[PDB]
Design a protein around this nucleic acid. Structure first.
Lengths: 92, 104, 78, 97, 94, 105, 84, 98
DNA sequence: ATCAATATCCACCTGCAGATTCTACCAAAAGTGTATTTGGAAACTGCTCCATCAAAAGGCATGTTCAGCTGAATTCAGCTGAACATGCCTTTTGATGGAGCAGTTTCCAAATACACTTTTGGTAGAATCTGCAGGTGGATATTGAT
DNA sequence: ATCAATATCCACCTGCAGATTCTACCAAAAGTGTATTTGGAAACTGCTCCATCAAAAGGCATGTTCAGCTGAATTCAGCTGAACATGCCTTTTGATGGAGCAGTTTCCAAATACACTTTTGGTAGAATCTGCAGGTGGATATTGAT
């Protein structure tokens, strides 16, 4: 028990900075970061769906949630990555 | 054959799903929602790691610390807005001294 | 105990805050404000504690308390 | 007999402290204050070291932030010396009062 | 078609209890509905979370009570917790 | 066929509040005492603000509570103000308040 | 229809003056009017933006008061009185 | 000819407007400003009358509160006349634009 | 602006210890293959509401004058807060133990979720009522000039 | 210390735009009889957590000096409030057409439910390493002083 996002953070770290490492304390911050953004996006999508009397959170909700939460440029890229991962998942 | 690899992500799609279901957000959850969400979490993570990576390099360090994440965030307009109500432990503040307070 | 938060320590905080010259009344003004801060946070934390029927305030109780006050903190379990 | 002009060392401390990230409040005195305030809410509590450490980080980041706004308020008043009325003005605009 | 619920029937009753002689304009009632819905959500919300932090799948009157203590200030809290407890123990007294 | 509200000794709809809890995705399951307790607090709070609103109405010599009356009651009660410190009441105006420095010297 | 331009100037000096009054302001410098318009414009952009986002998400062409109300809640400016 | 000294009428207006609750920006112009801004975001948008109503109430409530803070900033500078500088200090401390 | 004498910063190197990174293994997820439910999309369409128009009217927005008095400069000196060398003591910190207690387990009796079947309590309009928004007018200040 | 000049009340009036009730269904509580859990309630550990101890070391509490900053006292150019003359354009009323919310059905592509089958991520030791913390030695930044 006591799962975290460490492994995943670290893997993403090696893609953008193979050379770079990361202290424990710094890893704790990435964890906190991921949990926070996860809850905000999640939270907003929840409300969105409720506002429209829907019982299911789809990528449609997640996207609008990203649009409402992330600032301008960061929102664009997030929406890109998002639709890209969903697009590749449905295919194969 | 896991969903993350299928969506081609480093982040745990299957877990993001189990979390969405158990977080009491909605009665039902789409199949692409966890995928989508997982993709967003990874991107933002890369963004910070990238900038914090540089902040480290620009300081002669190889290993990223809290300071480096704080410098990466505060020195970036968008990341800073997104986390303007968040406090990174052990990150300190950006050096900045009001002009009026300078000598002569 | 609050007087335990010393002038030089408050000097240091102000400095990291960019403050050059400090008035002599700032010190007691700072303690009063620091005390109102901890009282609001700790009170919320200890409520999460008693709810969890514990005798030990955990870092998570403090993190959840800080989030309610709009003082979200990364690094201690969230 | 060397001596620095008032202000010179002050700026030097700003440059130093805005560069570091160590807690500026002495730990023991702090824990003592935390446990005391707490004693008023529930009796004989125990604190994870991590919890005391979270509280300190939070308050120090809060006070530092508050000093920034205070400094701005003092400057806005054509001053260079922060005062209680500056802390009071910031906390009012902030909605904490 | 398209029946939409409200708290008006209840706000109005409580009004007559406190000020028998007083009425309330619909706009003021509008304000009241927003208040009830807003507070209901904040409580339900904090409760939802309190339950989560404790690996608990159920929101009991105990969650609602601690949620009210986190949400409401001093006196309002003391009084609301009293009313709340009083109602529960009365409801359970069959 | 008693009503849960009456069993609780309340005006606010206990059943409705129990329905709104289940449909709000707050937790998997909902206790029987939760909706009761919550309808009790809701009723208490609308009672506290209608009391103060009613008095404001009386002072302005009106018999029907309007929004300005609600504002007066909220902004003048230290706790209701803190409770609704980030809420804006349409058509409620502000509290008569002029900084002293501004008054005829 | 008709092109919409410079409508920010519809926020006249006297209306801004009245708002300062309710806010308790006694003396207003000449530069205040252009600043207020600037600040109001940013205020509206953010609320309308979020509002219209809620509209689009529900595949509607009509911005409803609920949309505005949700947008205001997001932005931390909860409004009572239109909750509907 | 009779003449009130500068500031007397100003104070007369504060008492007046703090006593009332009516909207202070003209309706049509404001509806026109919203539609202009809304338009530069997404075209062919329609508005519920109450939506524009909710927008104005919020806007004026926001401006009125900003001016209070602004006023406090001027006073604190030992002035009585509010300046862009005050509005900017206000918004900066409000975390609306550090 | 230099002259000179402090003290400050600031590289380059360097050596160790606390962390990190790297390994070797197990339950609890996560992925599958089936078998059903069903949410809410598609296809009408009933029908509120929104966008426009027309028009008359007077509440206000505009612009211009004028000069009261406020904000911006200046001067100045008392005295508050910075820089310091001193002397002393509370905070560090580092085992050492004992122990108060989060964390698990193992039941299960009490409390919930269900799936239906009746029973009303509420919500949507008609049907009735009525505060109070404007309108007026003296009674009362409230101001600002002599 | 008076007054005109105006602005501010407060009470009295009266039909109507906006509440209060009065009626009727019917969506949604409430009453019943089962099928799951839920999450305490005792019993027991391994921990993290206080408590001392016990030195030592910075780090703080103190008293001097005095640099220079905050505030008070004066001036005064001209910005911004008060008043007014004009006449525009927002308000108010009502009407229309029809865009596009919303209510209903009809029902598949997609989601939830198992029952298993595999796989991965969280753990608790093992094998290096990034930097911290010092050490010079060398330009710098300061501040007194021709």
């Amino acid at each position: 028990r006591k799962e975290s996002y460490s492994i995943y953070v670290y893997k993403v770290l090696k893609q953008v900075h193979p050379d770079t490492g990361i202290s424990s304390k710094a890893m704790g911050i990435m964890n906190s970061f991921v949990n926070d953004i996860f809850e905000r996006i999640a939270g907003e999508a929840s409300r969105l769906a409720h506002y429209n009397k829907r019982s299911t959170i789809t990528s449609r909700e997640i996207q609008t949630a990203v649009r409402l939460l992330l600032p301008g440029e960061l929102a664009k890229h997030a929406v890109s990555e998002g639709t890209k991962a969903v697009t590749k998942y449905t295919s194969a | 054959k896991t969903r993350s690899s299928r969506a081609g992500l480093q982040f745990p799609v299957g877990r993001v799903h189990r979390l969405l279901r158990k977080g009491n957000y909605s009665e039902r959850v789409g199949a692409g929602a966890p995928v989508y969400l997982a993709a967003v979490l990874e991107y933002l993570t890369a963004e910070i790691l990238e900038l914090a990576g540089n902040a480290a390099r620009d300081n002669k360090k190889t290993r990223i610390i809290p300071r480096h994440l704080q410098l990466a965030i505060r020195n970036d307009e968008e990341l800073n807005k997104l986390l303007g109500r968040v406090t990174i432990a052990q990150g300190g503040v950006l050096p900045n001294i009001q002009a009026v307070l300078l000598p002569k | 105990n609050i007087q335990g938060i010393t002038k030089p320590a408050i000097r240091r905080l102000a400095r990291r805050g960019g403050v050059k010259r400090i008035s002599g009344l700032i010190y007691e003004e700072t303690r009063g404000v620091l005390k109102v801060f901890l009282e609001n946070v700790i009170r919320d934390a200890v409520t999460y504690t008693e709810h969890a029927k514990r005798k030990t305030v955990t870092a998570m109780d403090v993190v959840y308390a800080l989030k309610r006050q709009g003082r979200t903190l990364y690094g201690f379990g969230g | 007999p060397h001596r620095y002009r008032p202000g010179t060392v002050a700026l030097r401390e700003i440059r130093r402290y805005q560069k570091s990230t160590e807690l500026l409040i002495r730990k023991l005195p702090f824990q003592r204050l935390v446990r005391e305030i707490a004693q008023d809410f529930k009796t004989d509590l125990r604190f994870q070291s991590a919890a005391i450490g979270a509280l300190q980080e939070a308050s120090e980041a809060y006070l530092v932030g508050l000093f920034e706004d205070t400094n701005l308020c003092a400057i806005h008043a054509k001053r260079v010396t922060i005062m209680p009325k500056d802390i009071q003005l910031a906390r009012r605009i902030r909605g904490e009062r």
